[PDB]
Design a protein around this motif. Structure first.
Motif, PDB file in Angstrom:
ATOM      1  N   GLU A 451       0.794  -1.256   0.000  1.00 13.74           N
ATOM      2  CA  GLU A 451       0.000   0.000   0.000  1.00 13.74           C
ATOM      3  C   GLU A 451       0.810   1.282   0.000  1.00 13.74           C
ATOM      4  O   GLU A 451       0.260   2.371  -0.331  1.00 13.74           O
ATOM      5  N   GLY A 469      -1.573  -2.109  -4.601  1.00 11.89           N
ATOM      6  CA  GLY A 469      -2.182  -1.348  -3.538  1.00 11.89           C
ATOM      7  C   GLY A 469      -3.619  -1.030  -3.921  1.00 11.89           C
ATOM      8  O   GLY A 469      -4.039  -1.236  -5.069  1.00 11.89           O
ATOM      9  N   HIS A 471      -5.716   2.158  -3.754  1.00 12.74           N
ATOM     10  CA  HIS A 471      -5.405   3.573  -3.601  1.00 12.74           C
ATOM     11  C   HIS A 471      -6.578   4.237  -2.914  1.00 12.74           C
ATOM     12  O   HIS A 471      -7.731   4.243  -3.427  1.00 12.74           O
ATOM     13  N   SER A 473      -7.013   3.323   0.475  1.00 10.12           N
ATOM     14  CA  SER A 473      -7.125   2.545   1.703  1.00 10.12           C
ATOM     15  C   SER A 473      -6.263   3.066   2.833  1.00 10.12           C
ATOM     16  O   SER A 473      -6.535   2.683   3.973  1.00 10.12           O
ATOM     17  N   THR A 794      -9.179  -4.268   2.568  1.00 11.39           N
ATOM     18  CA  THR A 794      -7.765  -4.695   2.651  1.00 11.39           C
ATOM     19  C   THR A 794      -7.389  -5.379   3.944  1.00 11.39           C
ATOM     20  O   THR A 794      -6.232  -5.869   4.080  1.00 11.39           O
TER      21      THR A 794
END
Ligand SMILES: *[C@@H]1O[C@H](CO)[C@@H](O[C@@H]2O[C@H](CO)[C@@H](O[C@@H]3O[C@H](CO[C@H]4O[C@H](CO)[C@@H](O)[C@H](O[C@H]5O[C@H](CO)[C@@H](O)[C@H](O)[C@@H]5O[C@H]5O[C@H](CO)[C@@H](O)[C@H](O)[C@@H]5O)[C@@H]4O)[C@@H](O)[C@H](O[C@H]4O[C@H](CO)[C@@H](O)[C@H](O)[C@@H]4O[C@H]4O[C@H](CO)[C@@H](O)[C@H](O)[C@@H]4O)[C@@H]3O)[C@H](O)[C@H]2NC(C)=O)[C@H](O)[C@H]1NC(C)=O
Ligand SMILES: CC(C)c1cc(CNc2ncc(C(=O)N3CCC34CN(S(C)(=O)=O)C4)cn2)cc(OC(F)(F)F)c1
Ligand SMILES: [Ca+2]
Ligand SMILES: [Ca+2]
Ligand SMILES: [Cl-]
Ligand SMILES: [K+]
Ligand code: NA
Ligand SMILES: [Zn+2]
Length: 802
Positions: A451, A469, A471, A473, A794
């Motif tokens: 991330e 990642g 984007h 989070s 996530t």
């Protein structure tokens, strides 16, 4: 060839690399054995050490010194980092009170806050607490900035895979650096930690931060440091670069320390000899911060303190030897240590059979400290399969252990190692963010290192290259420069079929004993038109992000999105309250399958195919065991709720559905469950198209899933029931491999209560993993901010203690 007679004068730690045979003066020249003759003299000065003393204050500039205490050093940018402390009565940065940095406080001409990435090798997450008394500069960064209790590395928990993941936002299978050593069979070449082949650019995929920056007009310092350049010189060099003119000064930099990893291997993660390396890293942080403070940059620069992986206790005596299992041990090549990768020693050996190897390594000793896998059967959370450099046969090694080929390979030196499964507590590492763009005295939950690339891009005003990642989070780490994405648009809208087919149109070989009032006739029609859907579909229906044909099917106890292409649900959604009851399957319905009169015979499974397929049986996505009433229970036997299951996997699934779902509803004050199939036959982590499916139920068009998922959601405040939650959500998920045997579980001959939960924990998953694998987008209708939802998607439930 290096024509090493040119000079480094005025070129020390030059940013632009110059082409052979012209001699180099950049921070890698030593690594290529290519520095100009005068490099050590001009660029690696050491005279008088690294600190001003009282007597040097105001000295006459002598250019032989390592750093300077003369009056002109600040303008020149080359003072010793303690100059203003010793000579001007200033305080060390660590002795100053923390004060919120609300805005960047930068010298005129800075167009954006610089970023310095301070990377530390083998810095295990628990060092922040356990070493806190000996690391006051790091502790000030941690408590005054934004920190996480730990940061999750990628698998394998080795150096280059993690540093390069940090740089790219990519899993190792996608960036290509899949271990600390590798063989690429297309190139026919080997990559090693030491040596020269690693410098060839063909190994390194994706787009690392320094290239992302350059292509978008943001200048970068060189990230890589030769081992011989001392740490003090690395720091002084960054400080010099930051003193350059606006048009030449980089905006992004990296420092690297080989410690505490180097000592950790020799002494163990917590050996008494570890205190000194931690003290020395802290001193280095101190030098940077004092240095920044002298330049008036200590409230301008964003600093990231980050590790690659942690460190575990491992000794020579905890080695497993393949020569104790295989008689053919000399016909294989083992990449050894805290993981194992096996391939044929020779590709002209037609006798070499991977199936026989796996079998000879499976559950052979009662305490076996590794488990063999074909790489496609590894836990999907590892994302460790879709690269030709990853060998087909993999060994997942228990924490604290090594695997080796033969005892001669191991003859003890070392007490520490890393490389294990990335959910293991000892392999966790650190994150601290400090600066104007980070939040003030803020703790964030643990997150994965994949991330960070996106966030580093946000810190620098860059558009990230495509990466793994999610984007947004990590928007909760940031004061500003947050990235505000929009939900993906739904590509296929569903059909909502009514009753369109007569029972006698179905010839499916299916049988059910079901030939069995206006109050409950209107009541059941409303249930089929979606009257309970608000109970069972808590967060909206999932969005289908690809082109396909599907139907929404409503029922009393569950809703589903039924695929006309794959002949089964893509998803099935249901809510089980704390008070719900488990009932048994009545005898009259044991092998009952009923046609669904909303769905044509031609888009339905059939029981005959299952009867003919001697290997394949079937199960249900909504569990009949949790029906709300006897009348509702018939819905669970619809052919549209059926999915293909191996009898071995049915033992797993049945235990989950009959025992565990109710257990979770008790513990969590209700749960919402979404379950469904996954097809990933090419092990790329992404939803297969119809033409990628390698196995069908015999004689039919019914495709066989590689995996079954479930997403189990409840209220984070568990005093509120799942279906009446005001605030943030709590999630755990699984992606279970759909396998015809339970060879993975060595205790599977026992009762499911001794082994199924352990299997499921191993195959814990993020919601986002399921999304990639299905092409669905979950949690479309909550009352939560989208970034908070991205954080939830996530989350990984790791099942490790604190
Ligand atoms: C994690 O995030 C990453 C980044 O978003 C995701 O990876 C992407 O996945 C995409 C979907 O699979 C993939 O898209 C393909 O790209 C092909 C062009 O790729 C090259 O160019 C790009 C751009 O610069 C570059 O990134 C690629 O780099 C890869 O390959 C080099 C070696 O050359 C490696 O150094 C590097 O590490 C990287 O390797 C990784 O990806 C490749 C696949 O690209 C894997 O094989 C490796 O193992 C490793 O994982 C490349 O240099 C493009 O050609 C593809 O298009 C085909 O398929 C489409 C379907 O839409 C079809 O329409 C096209 O016509 C084409 O089909 C034809 O070719 C087929 C295959 O040869 C053939 O069978 C057919 O008959 C057709 O004739 C496709 O668009 C993208 O490359 C990668 N990017 C990266 C960096 O990996 C990843 O999915 C995420 N993971 C998860 C779980 O979400
Ligand atoms: C955090 C991210 C942004 C990042 C930081 C750095 C930092 N700089 C750096 N400099 C040199 C080495 C080095 O030398 N390391 C590692 C093992 C070995 C190789 N051996 S050795 C010198 O014995 O051959 C030690 C490592 N890091 C490099 C980097 O790029 C990369 F991913 F490609 F690594 C990315
Ligand atoms: Ca390392
Ligand atoms: Ca796939
Ligand atoms: Cl490796
Ligand atoms: K069967
Ligand atoms: Na077993
Ligand atoms: Zn190491």
């Amino acid at each position: 060839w290096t024509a090493t007679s040119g000079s480094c004068k005025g070129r020390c730690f030059e940013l632009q690399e110059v082409g052979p045979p012209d001699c180099r003066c950049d921070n890698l020249c030593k690594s290529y054995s290519s520095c100009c003759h005068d490099f050590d003299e001009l660029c690696l000065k050491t005279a008088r050490g690294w600190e001003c003393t009282k007597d040097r204050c105001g000295e006459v500039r002598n250019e032989e010194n390592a750093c300077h205490c003369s009056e002109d050093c600040l303008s020149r940018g080359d003072c010793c980092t303690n100059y203003q402390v010793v000579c001007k009565g200033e305080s060390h940065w660590v002795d100053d009170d923390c004060e919120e940095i609300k805005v960047p406080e930068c010298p005129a001409g800075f167009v954006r806050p610089p970023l310095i990435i301070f990377s530390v090798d083998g810095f295990r997450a628990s060092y922040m607490k356990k070493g806190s008394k000996v690391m006051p500069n790091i502790e000030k960064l941690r408590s005054c900035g934004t920190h996480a209790p730990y940061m999750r590395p990628v698998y394998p928990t080795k150096t280059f895979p993690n540093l390069y993941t940090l740089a790219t936002g990519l899993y190792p299978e996608s960036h290509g650096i899949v271990g600390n050593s590798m063989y690429d069979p297309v190139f026919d070449a080997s990559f090693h930690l030491r040596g020269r082949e690693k410098f060839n650019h063909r190994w390194w995929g994706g787009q690392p931060l320094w290239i992302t920056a350059t292509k978008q007009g943001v200048r970068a310092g060189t990230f890589f440091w030769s081992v011989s350049i001392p740490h003090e010189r690395r720091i002084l060099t960054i400080l010099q670069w930051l003193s350059l003119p606006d048009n030449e000064r980089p905006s992004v930099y990296a420092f690297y320390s080989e410690q505490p990893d180097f000592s950790g291997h020799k002494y163990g993660p917590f050996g008494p000899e570890m205190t000194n390396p931690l003290r020395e890293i802290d001193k280095t942080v101190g030098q940077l911060m004092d240095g920044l403070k002298q330049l008036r940059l200590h409230r301008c620069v964003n600093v990231i303190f980050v590790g690659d992986h942690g460190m575990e206790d491992v000794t020579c005596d905890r080695t497993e030897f393949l020569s104790n299992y295989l008689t053919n041990v000399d016909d294989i090549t083992l990449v050894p240590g805290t993981l194992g990768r096996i391939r044929a020693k020779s590709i002209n050996n037609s006798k070499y059979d991977p199936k026989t190897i796996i079998a000879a390594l499976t559950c052979k000793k009662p305490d076996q400290h590794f488990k063999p896998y074909m790489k496609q059967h590894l836990p999907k959370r590892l994302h460790y399969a879709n690269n030709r450099r990853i060998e087909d046969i993999h060994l997942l090694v228990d924490r604290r252990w090594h695997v080796a080929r033969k005892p001669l390979d191991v003859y003890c030196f070392f007490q520490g190692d890393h490389g294990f499964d990335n959910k293991v507590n000892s392999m966790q590492t650190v994150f601290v963010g400090y600066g104007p763009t980070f939040k003030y005295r803020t703790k964030v939950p643990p997150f994965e290192n994949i991330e960070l690339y996106n966030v580093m891009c946000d810190l620098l005003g860059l558009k990230p290259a495509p990466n793994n990642g999610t984007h947004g989070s990590l928007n909760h780490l940031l004061r500003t420069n947050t990235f505000r994405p929009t939900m993906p648009d739904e590509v296929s809208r569903p059909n909502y079929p009514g009753i369109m087919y007569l029972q006698s149109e179905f010839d499916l070989g299916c049988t059910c004993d079901d030939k069995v009032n206006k109050l409950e006739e209107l009541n059941k029609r409303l249930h089929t038109k979606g009257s309970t859907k608000e109970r069972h579909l808590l967060y909206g229906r999932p969005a289908v992000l690809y082109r396909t044909s599907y139907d929404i099917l409503y029922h009393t106890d569950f809703e589903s999105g039924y695929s006309e292409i794959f002949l089964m649900p893509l998803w099935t959604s249901y809510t089980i309250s704390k008070q719900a009851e488990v009932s048994s399957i009545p005898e009259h319905l044991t092998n009952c399958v009923r046609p669904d009169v909303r769905v044509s015979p031609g888009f339905s499974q059939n029981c005959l195919a299952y009867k003919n397929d001697k290997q394949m049986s079937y199960g249900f996505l909504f569990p009949p065991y949790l029906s709300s009433s006897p009348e509702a229970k018939y819905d669970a036997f619809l052919v549209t709720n059926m999915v293909p299951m191996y009898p071995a996997f049915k033992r797993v699934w049945a235990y989950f559905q009959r025992v565990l779902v109710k257990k979770y509803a008790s513990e969590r004050n209700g749960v919402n469950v979404i379950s469904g199939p996954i097809f990933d036959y090419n092990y790329d982590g992404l939803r297969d198209t119809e033409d990628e499916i390698k196995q069908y139920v015999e004689g039919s068009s019914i495709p066989v899933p590689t995996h079954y998922y479930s997403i189990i959601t409840s209220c984070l405040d568990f005093t509120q029931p799942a279906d009446k939650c005001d605030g943030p959500l709590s999630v755990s998920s699984f992606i279970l491999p759909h396998r015809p045997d339970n060879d993975e579980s060595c205790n599977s001959s026992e009762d499911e209560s001794k082994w199924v939960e352990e299997l499921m924990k191993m195959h814990t998953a993020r919601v986002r993993d399921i999304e990639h694998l299905t092409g669905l987008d979950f949690y479309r209708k909550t009352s939560r901010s989208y970034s908070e939802i991205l954080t939830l998607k996530t989350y990984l439930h790791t099942y490790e203690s604190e």
